[PDB]
CSV table of C-alpha atoms (C1' of nucleotides) in Angstrom, one decimal:
chain,number,residue,atom,x,y,z
A,276,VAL,CA,135.5,91.4,75.0
A,277,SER,CA,132.6,93.6,76.0
A,278,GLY,CA,130.2,90.9,75.1
A,279,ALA,CA,131.8,88.7,77.7
A,280,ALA,CA,131.0,91.3,80.3
A,281,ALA,CA,127.4,91.6,79.1
A,282,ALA,CA,126.9,87.8,79.2
A,283,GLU,CA,127.3,87.9,83.0
A,284,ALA,CA,124.6,90.5,83.3
A,285,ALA,CA,122.4,88.4,81.0
A,286,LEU,CA,123.0,85.3,83.2
A,287,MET,CA,122.1,87.2,86.4
A,288,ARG,CA,118.9,88.4,84.7
A,289,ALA,CA,118.1,84.9,83.7
A,290,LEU,CA,118.5,83.5,87.3
A,291,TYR,CA,116.4,86.5,88.4
A,292,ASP,CA,113.6,85.6,86.1
A,293,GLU,CA,113.7,82.0,87.2
A,294,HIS,CA,114.1,82.2,91.0
A,295,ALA,CA,113.4,85.7,92.4
A,296,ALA,CA,109.6,85.4,92.9
A,297,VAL,CA,109.8,81.9,94.4
A,298,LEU,CA,112.5,83.0,96.8
A,299,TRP,CA,110.4,86.0,97.7
A,300,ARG,CA,107.5,83.7,98.6
A,301,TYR,CA,109.7,81.6,100.7
A,302,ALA,CA,111.2,84.5,102.6
A,303,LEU,CA,107.7,86.0,102.9
A,304,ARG,CA,106.5,82.9,104.8
A,305,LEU,CA,109.6,82.8,107.0
A,306,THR,CA,109.3,86.5,108.0
A,307,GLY,CA,105.7,87.6,107.3
A,308,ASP,CA,106.9,91.1,106.1
A,309,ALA,CA,107.1,91.6,102.3
A,310,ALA,CA,109.5,94.6,102.6
A,311,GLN,CA,111.8,92.2,104.5
A,312,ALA,CA,111.3,89.5,101.9
A,313,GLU,CA,112.5,91.8,99.2
A,314,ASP,CA,115.6,92.6,101.2
A,315,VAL,CA,116.3,88.9,101.7
A,316,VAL,CA,115.9,88.3,98.0
A,317,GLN,CA,118.3,91.1,97.0
A,318,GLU,CA,120.9,89.9,99.5
A,319,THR,CA,120.6,86.3,98.4
A,320,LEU,CA,121.0,87.0,94.7
A,321,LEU,CA,123.9,89.4,95.5
A,322,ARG,CA,125.6,86.5,97.2
A,323,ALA,CA,124.7,84.3,94.2
A,324,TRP,CA,126.5,86.8,92.0
A,325,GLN,CA,129.6,86.7,94.3
A,326,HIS,CA,129.8,82.9,94.1
A,327,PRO,CA,130.5,81.7,90.5
A,328,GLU,CA,130.5,78.1,91.8
A,329,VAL,CA,126.7,78.2,92.3
A,330,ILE,CA,126.1,79.8,88.9
A,331,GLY,CA,128.5,77.5,86.9
A,332,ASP,CA,126.7,74.2,87.1
A,333,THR,CA,123.2,74.5,85.5
A,334,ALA,CA,122.7,70.7,85.8
A,335,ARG,CA,122.6,71.2,89.6
A,336,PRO,CA,119.7,73.0,91.3
A,337,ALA,CA,120.8,76.5,92.5
A,338,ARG,CA,117.3,77.1,93.9
A,339,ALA,CA,118.1,74.9,97.0
A,340,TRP,CA,121.3,76.9,97.7
A,341,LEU,CA,119.2,80.1,97.4
A,342,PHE,CA,116.7,78.8,99.9
A,343,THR,CA,119.4,77.8,102.3
A,344,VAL,CA,121.1,81.2,102.1
A,345,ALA,CA,117.8,83.0,102.7
A,346,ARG,CA,116.9,80.7,105.6
A,347,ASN,CA,120.3,81.5,107.3
A,348,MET,CA,119.8,85.2,106.7
A,349,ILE,CA,116.4,85.2,108.2
A,350,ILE,CA,117.5,83.3,111.3
A,351,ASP,CA,120.3,85.8,111.7
A,352,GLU,CA,117.8,88.6,111.6
A,353,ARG,CA,115.9,86.9,114.5
A,354,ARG,CA,118.5,87.7,117.2
A,355,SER,CA,119.3,90.4,119.7
A,356,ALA,CA,118.6,93.6,117.7
A,357,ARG,CA,115.1,92.3,116.9
A,358,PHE,CA,114.8,90.6,120.3
A,359,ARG,CA,114.7,93.8,122.3
A,360,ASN,CA,113.1,96.3,119.9
A,361,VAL,CA,110.6,94.6,117.7
B,264,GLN,CA,80.9,69.5,76.3
B,265,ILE,CA,80.7,73.1,77.5
B,266,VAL,CA,78.1,73.9,74.8
B,267,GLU,CA,76.4,70.6,75.7
B,268,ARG,CA,76.0,71.5,79.3
B,269,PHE,CA,75.3,75.3,79.1
B,270,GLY,CA,73.4,75.4,75.9
B,271,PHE,CA,69.9,76.3,77.2
B,272,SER,CA,71.1,79.8,78.0
B,273,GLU,CA,72.3,82.5,75.6
B,274,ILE,CA,74.5,84.2,78.1
B,275,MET,CA,76.8,81.2,78.3
B,276,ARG,CA,76.9,81.0,74.5
B,277,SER,CA,78.0,84.6,74.5
B,278,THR,CA,80.5,83.8,77.3
B,279,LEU,CA,82.2,81.0,75.3
B,280,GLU,CA,82.1,83.1,72.1
B,281,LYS,CA,83.6,86.2,73.7
B,282,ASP,CA,86.3,84.1,75.3
B,283,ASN,CA,89.9,85.1,74.4
B,284,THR,CA,92.0,81.9,74.6
B,285,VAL,CA,91.1,78.3,73.9
B,286,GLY,CA,92.9,75.1,74.9
B,287,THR,CA,93.3,72.9,78.0
B,288,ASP,CA,97.0,73.7,78.3
B,289,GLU,CA,96.4,77.4,77.5
B,290,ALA,CA,93.7,78.5,79.9
B,291,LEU,CA,95.7,76.6,82.6
B,292,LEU,CA,98.7,78.8,82.0
B,293,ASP,CA,96.4,81.8,81.9
B,294,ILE,CA,95.2,81.0,85.4
B,295,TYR,CA,98.8,80.4,86.4
B,296,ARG,CA,100.0,83.8,85.2
B,297,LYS,CA,97.1,85.6,86.8
B,298,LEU,CA,97.4,83.7,90.1
B,299,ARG,CA,101.2,83.5,90.7
B,300,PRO,CA,102.7,86.2,88.6
B,301,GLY,CA,106.5,86.5,87.9
B,302,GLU,CA,107.1,82.8,87.6
B,303,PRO,CA,107.8,80.5,84.6
B,304,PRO,CA,104.5,78.9,83.6
B,305,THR,CA,104.8,75.2,83.2
B,306,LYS,CA,101.8,73.0,82.3
B,307,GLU,CA,102.4,70.8,85.3
B,308,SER,CA,103.4,73.7,87.6
B,309,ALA,CA,99.8,74.9,87.2
B,310,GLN,CA,98.3,71.4,87.0
B,311,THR,CA,99.8,71.0,90.5
B,312,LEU,CA,98.4,74.1,92.2
C,92,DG,C1',84.6,110.0,72.9
C,93,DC,C1',82.4,107.4,77.4
C,94,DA,C1',82.4,103.3,80.9
C,95,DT,C1',85.8,102.1,84.5
C,96,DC,C1',87.8,102.7,88.8
C,97,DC,C1',90.2,105.1,92.1
C,98,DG,C1',90.0,107.8,96.3
C,99,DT,C1',87.3,110.6,99.5
C,100,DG,C1',84.1,111.1,103.3
C,101,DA,C1',81.1,109.0,107.1
C,102,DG,C1',78.8,112.6,115.9
C,103,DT,C1',80.9,114.2,120.4
C,104,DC,C1',82.7,113.3,125.7
C,105,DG,C1',83.6,109.6,129.2
C,106,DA,C1',86.0,106.3,133.8
D,87,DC,C1',131.7,82.0,109.5
D,88,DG,C1',129.4,78.7,105.3
D,89,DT,C1',125.5,78.1,103.0
D,90,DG,C1',123.9,73.9,98.2
D,91,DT,C1',118.5,66.8,96.4
D,92,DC,C1',111.3,68.3,97.7
D,93,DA,C1',111.8,72.7,100.0
D,94,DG,C1',106.8,78.6,98.2
D,95,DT,C1',101.6,84.8,102.6
D,96,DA,C1',97.5,84.9,105.7
D,97,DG,C1',93.8,86.8,104.9
D,98,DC,C1',89.9,87.9,102.8
D,99,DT,C1',84.3,91.6,100.4
D,100,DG,C1',79.5,91.5,104.8
D,101,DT,C1',80.4,99.7,103.9
D,102,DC,C1',78.6,103.2,100.3
D,103,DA,C1',77.6,107.6,98.1
D,104,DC,C1',79.8,110.6,94.9
D,105,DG,C1',82.6,112.9,91.8
D,106,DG,C1',86.3,113.0,88.3
D,107,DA,C1',90.6,111.7,86.6
D,108,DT,C1',92.1,107.4,84.4
D,109,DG,C1',91.8,104.2,80.6
D,110,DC,C1',89.9,100.5,76.2
DNA sequence: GCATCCGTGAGTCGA
DNA sequence: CGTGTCAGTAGCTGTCACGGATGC
């Protein structure tokens, strides 16, 4: 029903309230730019929404998966396009 | 013990009277929510930092 | 109705 | 491309006069 579709939004908002700020701090240390940390956070939680396998098990820490995804994103930003211009 | 230590001055009495929250596990979470906002405040998560 | 706090300004010219 | 046990800024206040919108 429609409540089944609203439950997914409630679940995303819950994982937001529990992981967004900590992931922002982590990305902020790895990059040093807060405006970049916000982008990393948005993209990481977007990939979290696209993977129901990470949001299914609550007895397993999804925070570590979030940190790993953010780390890979940040190291991908650190290549050629930044290399020349930054 | 706070009244025991800072009793010789009336400004500290007024400080402890005008205080908002009381409790060892309460002011700790207050400091947590004013220091690292946007995070779930656990007694031990603040006891750690 | 007023204390708080925010935002504004703070010389000119040099190799 | 896939990602999955702790995993969490640097820096910093050593400016100030002044006016008026903002706020308990």
